[PDB]
């Protein structure tokens, strides 16, 4: 953990080849409190992560991290609040130029790997500091199915079949990793139960229809909605029954 | 340590400090609070007189950033009147492009995206002012969004910035908002910040009344004298 | 010898070019050896 | 923004250029440059340090590189850099000095103003009457008979000081020269074909060529200086 | 943005920063390059932390034009830019010539791009050593960009962690006689050195270069040439 | 942009960028220039002259105009921008009043364009001296000197460089209207004032003569160690 | 400390210092009063001199025919904002034809000196203002502050000393609203004498006033034409 | 360092302005009177070798037929604010026809200090304050008028100011021998006897500057001859 300089500072080298800075940013998805869970099925893609109002004065209803960034294309936030948005409000422009100027709505790997060279701008140039936030897309391609892309502060981005950012993202790596390791082509219906699971599992909450949102993509239908309290609640009754 | 001389740089435990120093600002600031009633959206200002030199109507908190959204501010003064034409050309930009009112939800949105683009480069500062934009209409109905200086907006039924912000969420919180109308608010509203008002402390405040709602047609506008004072002489009965 | 020549470089080049002379058994010393003496101190 | 700057161009207190003079230390580290001028032609030999066996040989020259029709130039330093001058020097392209007064012009912008670091190469220019030039990233630039930068410029300049006879030389003594010089100035005691790189410019009919020896002709040249030098090892 | 080079001489007469970037590129995952005789072969680790990473999803060896492929070792994202870059200057060289980019043309402009980097201001250098194969004229190319900005050409090199023995490996393993399908067997032996764990067809990246253009080997053929290995 | 201020004053009050750049004068070749009736005499000091360096090349002394010629002292590079920003002008004034230029104007121009770098954003200051000789319209010999800061002062004679207060001091005690009564005796005085920090002798002097209605002359090293006879010969006669 | 260097810096405690340092110049500049009424504004000022044989520094500038301003602080800053605002003035007359509210002028200055105070390598305005103004609203007394943050007083004070002349204009504040043009001339050059040592005294060469009224242009008075107002009021105790 | 240009003291003082200040201190000392008859400018021209021409230390400048400037501080700054009063001033005269007046030419100068800074500004734009005092002197519609500009931009009309390495000495003998009602060839002396008093060398016709602007009569450099007049007596 060598430094010589201003290498804590600005995204500039560390003398063992370190970007302190970014690697500062990944500490800042951790400040908001929130873990983020996106499992991928064989025909459906789910993002959940939990909600949290701390007194009745707030709007519920404004408390999302989960974004409409296009029709068919919805994304969760974890992270700074403010960061995350100026990155919702930047995908959906994206998204949007992509669509004027090509002609057919944007992938979800090309969509990402926009945001991902956005932010790596920002781990190149000094004068400003990587969004301390991570975004995790999800979406219905023509050919390749469902979609799970993580877009973290440094620029990485890579498919996942199930993967997990905010403070409990290793606890529920290894939730996920061990499920997928049973080689299920889950239903929509198994997605959102092992989506709400491993958020449920690692945080021990035991949800109620109101601390946790829950949006899906599903190839009959490749429209990203936010699912109603009373729909998650038909899932987390059948979660429990079993 | 030089974590905390810019904006662009993180601390090593992922927290901009400039930003957080932006937000003891507003804490030094008087309390301004809010509250979203049935039909509309009340605001009150704590407005400490600094002098008895300063006319009634110096350092105005609360402002008209559009005919049907308010603004009530709370830190560093300049700053607040800088966002408050920052949302004035927002909302006016709205009107010039796509022919309507600018719904308070994009307005929040667009003025806190500025806000937190002065939280990102080393060349700005963070603003130092905390505010919320208050705004009523027959379709969208009342709304009360507050944003602070990291550039976080969320919607709101009762909210206060300043010093006693504490103190005032516990009262806003023994109100039933989702039932009573602006008229009962108004006198809660000033009780309330009457309340949290240190009169030990720093005193001598006034109190800034201003509201949105069905019964000004969705007009922001400051709670007529009348009223007003019908209020305050409310308020200060309920300290006994 | 150099352009930038300090006095101690010029005792270093005295004293190698009379080790010089001491190698080759010798009491007088030869402007060869001031030669290799410059290129041992001012070079390599 | 003030707190990160190195503020390259500045003055020392003792009036120096700090970057420039580190600049200059990189040159030193950097492979050995010579250049001999000659009645006849000019020779820019320079020492390879990209030796590895792995290492392809594709391009026509390793650290010489052709300005134009007239002009070579060989570099010493920074390879990056060196990449930039070079061909801001074709686009600047020409008589000699003209050329090189005006990459120096671009060198010294640098060390004035911009707040950019200096460009850490050093040049060796050759063309054609037949001239020799040296630039350094202060953008200082002068003629030469015989110079040496790199690395130990200073002993290779010392051995052209004492055997370079002016006026009277030939290609063939140039290059002989080189040889010689480059023998003491690398640490190799037998300097190989294969880590030396010569390259000649002559006037033939009234056209310049610009040539680079083959590693044929070059062992010619170690085996002969070898011999030569074993010829004065037969006197004592 | 900032106007000052963030790049400077060290007292020593080095770029400092520059090291530092190579010192990221020697923790970067190894990159194994081989020139055979009638083609060029390129070979990466490419490992995921876990299964739940999509391997196919984003690729290390990438295309440039129909002739010239990518591999580093360094950082990800830099990567990323530098193949831009690259694919734009192949693209900016196409529409006036007419012809596809020559392989030493494409590394001088992409090394060009690396060296402003280390000059420009407020900006750092990328992370990454870019290791260019391609095929022109009917020979093989196989080039190595630096950090710095410098270019190599190699008969054959690795990059990343280990490099200094893969590239002894390499010398003791690398005969200019060699054929594609050797270089494979050589590349993949190279990589297994450094390489720990077990090597699938997912968890290397494999692409070539010949007469027909370069492509990325499918995970499919991979595993052919793996079989082989032991 | 580097915009950013580089000369700032010290809270004593002293812009320290421009004294350290008089103090990169202080490490340049001695340049001595003396004004005579009707010439006008140059001479800078040669740093460690080298057999294998082209003479022609290394030159201290240079002409803007056909009547204007400056030597300097400080950075090279830096006074090659300097002369080549200056012989832009002496042009464009030549073409605008149709008239050669004065010392005093290119001398003006050259001070001006030096303020201008310790008062401008991203710029360092110019870390030379200028020793600009020349003659008018009216065959008035003119001397004038420039530093890093802009001032520009006339001088009957002057020395800029390591040894500049060596020499101006011998200049103060042998400059008189005898000293300057011929051409020859007033060449002698440069070589004079250069031989008091030149300590091998006519081989380290470079020497360049404007005379009235001709061009600039630089002295062959013949020609100098004809001049440095003499000075020795009326050395013994003295003693 | 490391707080204090830029603008842009903000301190632990949620202040900027740089913008407090400016605040100082303001309080480093000479006293000067303003205080309004009924149907006038009127600004006195201390003016002071370098030497005794150089001229006193004029303080009250002409903006507008309706508008008048007291400066205090560094005066080439002054002469900046004043030019703005003299520009400001001139700009409505020529679109709109009518006097620039001072209330929305105050507002333009107010805007005009926050963006200094947020970016990289700027200064706030180290100068402070005391805008005296007559519209369709009444006389206005306006004070601004090098924080960009502006007030309306009724009755204002600033400069050095000047917290001496607020407890003045604070004491006997009811009586200006009611009181005439001469009264309320007299209140602030009792004011501005609070400012003053003990052993010094409000003459001809020091004092400069400007008054705004409804039917009356703003006009600042001098040496000559301060001594109509200077005779009237007693000594001090 | 990390101060920037624009940079206030925890006193309220703009810490270059206040720098630039102490440069005037190290120049050489100049005396203006402001009389009935006209207005005295007299510099010390500070000869420092005998070989320098006195004649090209030009430390009072024309900057019209009736203002003249005298400088002391860095003199290589104010060559910048001088063009400018050179170039308003016939600006004036293109667009009024007629000669600006003293203060408007010293308050025109005085904007050019303060218009300093490091970032957000023009390429021209200077990075630090002009390290010269100046001593405006001239006759215009209010008669002769002394104006006095430090590097702060602050201009104000003086009776009789000293700047420059003596300006505390030389402004207290001023205060001891200025009257309203004297005459011009009174202050010619007086400034000259004020100045051989602080000169560090003997005051003689050759080291010295004066400059008069009297009402009707332009701006007269005082010749070696007219010097000597003066001389001769004190």
């Given at each position: ?242 | ?240 | ?44 | ?112 103003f ?123 | ?230 | 942009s580097?915009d950013?201020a580089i000369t700032v004053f010290?809270?004593?009050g002293?812009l320290?960028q421009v ?45 803007l105009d056909?009547?204007v ?12 921008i300097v002369?080549n920003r200056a012989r832009v002008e002496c042009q464009s004034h030549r073409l605008t009043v149709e008239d050669p230029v004065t010392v005093e104007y290119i001398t003006r121009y050259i001070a001006s364009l030096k303020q201008r770098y310790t008062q401008s954003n991203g710029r360092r200051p110019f870390?030379?001296?200028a020793?600009i000789?020349?003659?008018d319209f009216?065959?008035?010999?003119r001397?004038y000197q420039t530093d890093p800061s802009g001032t520009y002062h006339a ?85 | ?53 150089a001229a006193?520094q004029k303080?009250?500038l002409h903006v ?7 400066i205090?602080?560094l005066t080439a800053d002054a002469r900046l904002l004043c030019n703005f605002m003299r520009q400001e003035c001139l700009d409505?007359?020529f ?17 005009k ?9 700027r200064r706030?305005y180290?100068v ?110 | 360092?990390?101060?920037?240009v624009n ?7 703009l810490?270059q302005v206040?720098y630039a200040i102490?440069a005037i201190?190290?120049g050489s000392?100049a005396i203006g009177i402001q009389?009935?008859?006209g207005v005295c400018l007299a510099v010390?021209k ?7 021409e006195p004649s090209s230390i030009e430390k009072i400048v024309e900057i019209d037929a009736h203002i003249g400037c005298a400088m002391s501080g860095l003199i290589a700054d104010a060559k910048t604010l001088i063009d400018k009063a050179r170039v308003e001033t016939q600006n004036h005269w293109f667009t009024y026809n007629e000669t600006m007046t003293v203060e408007s030419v010293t308050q025109a100068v005085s904007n050019l200090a303060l218009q300093f800074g490091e970032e957000d500004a023009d390429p021209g734009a200077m990075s630090r304050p002009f390290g010269v005092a100046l001593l405006f002197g001239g006759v215009d519609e209010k008669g002769p008028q002394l104006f006095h500009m430090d590097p702060s931009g602050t201009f104000v009309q003086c009776?009789?100011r000293?700047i420059g ?44 500057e004066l400059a008069t602007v009297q009402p009707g009569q332009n701006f007269h450099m005082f010749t ?11």
């Amino acid at each position: 953990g060598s430094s010589a300089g201003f290498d804590r500072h600005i995204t500039i080298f560390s003398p063992e080849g370190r970007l302190y800075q970014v690697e500062y940013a990944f500490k800042a998805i951790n400040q908001g409190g929130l873990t983020s869970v996106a499992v991928r099925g064989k025909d459906c893609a789910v993002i959940v992560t939990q909600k949290k109002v701390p007194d009745k004065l707030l709007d519920s209803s404004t408390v999302t991290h989960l974004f409409k960034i296009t029709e068919n294309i919805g994304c969760v936030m974890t992270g700074m609040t403010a960061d995350s948005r100026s990155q919702v409000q930047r995908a959906r422009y994206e998204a949007a130029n992509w669509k004027y100027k090509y002609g057919y709505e944007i992938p979800v790997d090309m969509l990402c790997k926009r945001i991902a060279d956005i932010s790596q701008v920002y781990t190149q140039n000094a004068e400003m500091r990587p969004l301390g936030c991570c975004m995790i897309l999800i979406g219905i391609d023509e050919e390749q199915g469902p979609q799970v892309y993580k877009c973290d502060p440094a620029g990485y981005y890579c498919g996942f079949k199930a993967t997990a950012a905010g403070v409990k993202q290793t606890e529920s790596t290894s939730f996920l990793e061990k499920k997928v390791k049973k080689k299920f082509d889950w239903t929509f219906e198994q997605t959102v139960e092992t989506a709400i699971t491993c958020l449920s599992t690692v945080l021990s909450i035991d949800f109620k229809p109101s601390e946790i949102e829950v949006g899906v993509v599903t190839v009959e239908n490749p429209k990203f909605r936010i699912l109603t309290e009373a729909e998650i609640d038909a899932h987390l009754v059948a979660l429990a029954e079993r | 340590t030089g974590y905390d001389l810019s904006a662009s740089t993180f601390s090593p435990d992922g927290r901009v400090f400039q930003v957080e120093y932006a937000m003891k600002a507003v804490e030094n600031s008087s309390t301004a609070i809010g509250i979203r009633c049935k039909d509309g959206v009340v605001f009150g200002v704590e407005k400490l007189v600094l002098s008895k030199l300063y006319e009634e109507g110096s350092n105005k908190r609360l402002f008209n950033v559009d005919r049907h959204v308010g603004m009530a501010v709370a830190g560093l003064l300049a700053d607040a009147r800088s966002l408050a034409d920052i949302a004035r050309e927002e909302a006016s930009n709205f009107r010039s492009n796509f022919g309507y009112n600018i719904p308070l939800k994009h307005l929040a949105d667009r003025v806190a995206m500025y806000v937190h683009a002065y939280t990102l480069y080393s060349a700005v500062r963070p603003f130092g002012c905390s505010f919320m934009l208050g705004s009523y209409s027959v379709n969208d109905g009342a709304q009360l969004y507050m944003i602070d200086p990291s550039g976080v907006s969320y919607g709101y039924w009762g909210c206060a910035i300043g010093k006693a912000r504490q103190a005032a969420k516990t009262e806003i919180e023994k109100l039933q908002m989702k039932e009573m109308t602006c008229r009962d608010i108004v006198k809660e509203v000033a009780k309330i910040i009457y309340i949290v008002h240190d009169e030990v402390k720093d005193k001598a405040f006034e109190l800034e009344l201003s509201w949105v709602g069905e019964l000004t047609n969705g007009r922001h506008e400051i709670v007529p004298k009348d009223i007003r004072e019908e209020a305050e002489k409310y308020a200060k009965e309920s300290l006994k | 010898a150099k352009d930038d020549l300090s006095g101690a470089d010029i005792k270093a080049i005295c004293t190698e070019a009379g080790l010089m002379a001491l190698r080759e058994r010798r009491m007088k010393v030869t402007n060869e050896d001031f030669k290799k003496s410059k290129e041992n101190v001012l070079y390599k | 923004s003030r707190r990160y700057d190195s503020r390259t161009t500045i003055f020392s207190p003792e009036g120096r250029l700090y970057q420039v003079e580190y600049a200059m230390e990189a040159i030193g580290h950097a492979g050995t440059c010579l250049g001999i001028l000659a009645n006849d032609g000019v020779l820019l030999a320079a020492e390879r340090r990209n030796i590895h066996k792995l290492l392809d040989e594709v391009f026509f020259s390793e650290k010489i590189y052709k300005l134009n029709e007239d002009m070579a130039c060989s570099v010493a330093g920074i390879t990056s850099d060196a990449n930039v001058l070079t061909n801001e020097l074709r686009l600047i392209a020409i008589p000699c000095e003209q050329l090189v007064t005006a990459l120096c012009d671009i060198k010294q912008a640098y060390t004035q103003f911009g707040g950019k670091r200096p460009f850490g190469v050093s040049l060796l220019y050759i063309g054609w009457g037949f001239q020799l030039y040296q630039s350094d990233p202060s953008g200082n630039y002068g003629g030469w008979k015989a110079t040496c930068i790199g690395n130990n410029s200073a002993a290779a300049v010392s051995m052209l000081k004492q055997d370079y006879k002016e006026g009277e030389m030939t290609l063939k003594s140039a290059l002989a020269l080189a040889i010689k010089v480059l023998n003491k100035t690398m640490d190799v005691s037998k300097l190989s074909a294969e880590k030396v790189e010569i390259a000649t410019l002559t006037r033939e009919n009234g056209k310049t060529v610009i040539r680079v020896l083959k590693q044929k002709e070059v062992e010619q040249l170690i085996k002969k200086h070898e011999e030569e030098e074993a010829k004065a090892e037969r006197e004592k | 943005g900032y106007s000052f080079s963030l790049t400077t001489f060290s007292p020593s007469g080095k770029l400092v920063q520059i090291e530092y970037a190579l010192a990221a590129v020697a923790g970067g995952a190894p990159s194994v390059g081989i020139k055979a005789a009638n083609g060029v072969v390129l070979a990466t680790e490419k490992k995921q932390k876990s299964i739940l990473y999509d391997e196919r999803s984003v690729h290390k060896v990438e295309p440039i034009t129909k002739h010239i492929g990518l591999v580093y070792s360094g950082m990800g994202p830099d990567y990323r830019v530098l193949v831009h870059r690259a694919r734009k200057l192949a693209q900016q060289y196409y529409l006036v010539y007419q012809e596809p980019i020559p392989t030493a043309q494409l590394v001088q402009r992409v090394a060009s791009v690396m060296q402003e980097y280390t000059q420009s201001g407020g900006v750092r250098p990328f992370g990454v050593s870019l290791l260019i194969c391609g095929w022109n004229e009917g020979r093989p190319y196989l080039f190595q960009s630096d950090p710095s900005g410098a270019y190599f050409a190699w008969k054959a090199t690795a990059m990343g962690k280990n490099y200094v023995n893969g590239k002894t490996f390499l010398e003791k393993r690398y005969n200019e006689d060699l054929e594609l399908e050797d270089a494979i067997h050589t590349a993949i032996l190279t990589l297994k050195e450094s390489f720990e764990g077990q090597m699938t067809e997912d968890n290397i990246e494999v692409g070539i270069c010949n007469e027909a253009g370069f492509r990325r080997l499918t995970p499919t053929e991979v595993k052919d040439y793996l079989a082989a290995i032991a | 942009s580097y915009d950013r201020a580089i000369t700032v004053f010290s809270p004593d009050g002293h812009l320290f960028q421009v004294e350290y750049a008089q103090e990169a004068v202080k490490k340049g070749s001695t340049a001595v220039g003396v004004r005579g009736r009707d010439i006008v005499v140059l001479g800078v000091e040669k740093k460690s002259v080298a057999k294998l360096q082209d003479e022609r090349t290394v030159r201290k002394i240079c002409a803007l105009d056909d009547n204007v010629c400056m030597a300097f002292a400080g950075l090279t590079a830096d006074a090659r921008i300097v002369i080549n920003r200056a012989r832009v002008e002496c042009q464009s004034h030549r073409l605008t009043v149709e008239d050669p230029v004065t010392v005093e104007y290119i001398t003006r121009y050259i001070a001006s364009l030096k303020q201008r770098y310790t008062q401008s954003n991203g710029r360092r200051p110019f870390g030379i001296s200028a020793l600009i000789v020349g003659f008018d319209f009216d065959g008035t010999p003119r001397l004038y000197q420039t530093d890093p800061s802009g001032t520009y002062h006339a001088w009957k004679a002057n020395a800029i460089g390591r040894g500049a207060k060596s020499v101006r001091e011998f200049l103060e005690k042998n400059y008189t209207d005898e000293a300057i009564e011929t051409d020859d005796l007033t060449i002698k005085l440069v070589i004079k004032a250069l031989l008091e920090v030149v300590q091998s002798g006519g081989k380290n002097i470079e020497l360049a003569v404007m005379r009235r209605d001709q061009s600039l002359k630089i002295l062959n090293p013949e020609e100098i160690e004809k001049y440095v006879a003499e000075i020795e010969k009326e050395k013994e006669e003295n003693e | 400390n490391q707080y204090d260097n830029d603008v842009t810096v903000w301190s632990p405690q949620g202040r900027i210092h740089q913008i407090e340092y400016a605040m100082e110049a303001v309080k480093q500049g000479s006293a000067t009063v303003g205080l309004k009424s009924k149907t006038h504004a009127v600004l006195v000022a201390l003016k002071r001199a370098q030497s005794e044989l150089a001229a006193h520094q004029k303080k009250i500038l002409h903006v507008d025919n309706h508008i008048g301003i007291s400066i205090a602080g560094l005066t080439a800053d002054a002469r900046l904002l004043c030019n703005f605002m003299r520009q400001e003035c001139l700009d409505s007359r020529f679109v709109f034809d009518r006097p620039l509210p001072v209330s929305r002028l105050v507002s333009l200055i107010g805007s005009k000196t926050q963006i200094p105070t947020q970016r990289y390598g700027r200064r706030p305005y180290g100068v402070g203002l005391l805008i005296a103004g007559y519209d369709d609203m009444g006389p206005h007394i306006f004070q601004t502050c090098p924080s960009a943050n502006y007030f309306d007083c009724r009755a204002m004070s600033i400069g050095a000393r000047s917290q001496s002349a607020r407890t003045y204009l604070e004491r006997h504040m009811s009586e200006f609203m009611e009181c005439n043009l001469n009264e309320l001339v007299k209140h602030g050059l009792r004011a501005l004498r609070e400012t003053l040592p003990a052993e010094q005294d409000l003459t001809t060469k020091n004092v400069s006033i400007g008054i705004v009224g409804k039917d009356l242009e703003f006009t600042i008075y001098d040496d000559d034409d301060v001594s109509p107002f200077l005779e009237g009021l007693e000594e001090r105790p | 360092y990390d101060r920037g240009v624009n940079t206030f003291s925890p006193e309220g003082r703009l810490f270059q302005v206040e720098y630039a200040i102490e440069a005037i201190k190290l120049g050489s000392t100049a005396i203006g009177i402001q009389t009935s008859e006209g207005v005295c400018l007299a510099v010390e021209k500070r000869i420092t070798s005998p070989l320098m021409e006195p004649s090209s230390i030009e430390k009072i400048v024309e900057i019209d037929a009736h203002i003249g400037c005298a400088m002391s501080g860095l003199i290589a700054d104010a060559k910048t604010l001088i063009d400018k009063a050179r170039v308003e001033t016939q600006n004036h005269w293109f667009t009024y026809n007629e000669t600006m007046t003293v203060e408007s030419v010293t308050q025109a100068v005085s904007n050019l200090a303060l218009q300093f800074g490091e970032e957000d500004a023009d390429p021209g734009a200077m990075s630090r304050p002009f390290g010269v005092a100046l001593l405006f002197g001239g006759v215009d519609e209010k008669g002769p008028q002394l104006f006095h500009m430090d590097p702060s931009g602050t201009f104000v009309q003086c009776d009789a100011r000293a700047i420059g390495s003596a300006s505390e000495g030389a402004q207290s003998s001023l205060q001891e021998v200025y009257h309203k009602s004297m005459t011009l060839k009174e202050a010619i002396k007086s400034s000259l006897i004020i100045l051989k008093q602080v000169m560090e060398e003997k005051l003689n016709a050759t080291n010295i500057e004066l400059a008069t602007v009297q009402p009707g009569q332009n701006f007269h450099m005082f010749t070696k001859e007219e010097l000597e007049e003066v001389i001769k007596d004190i």
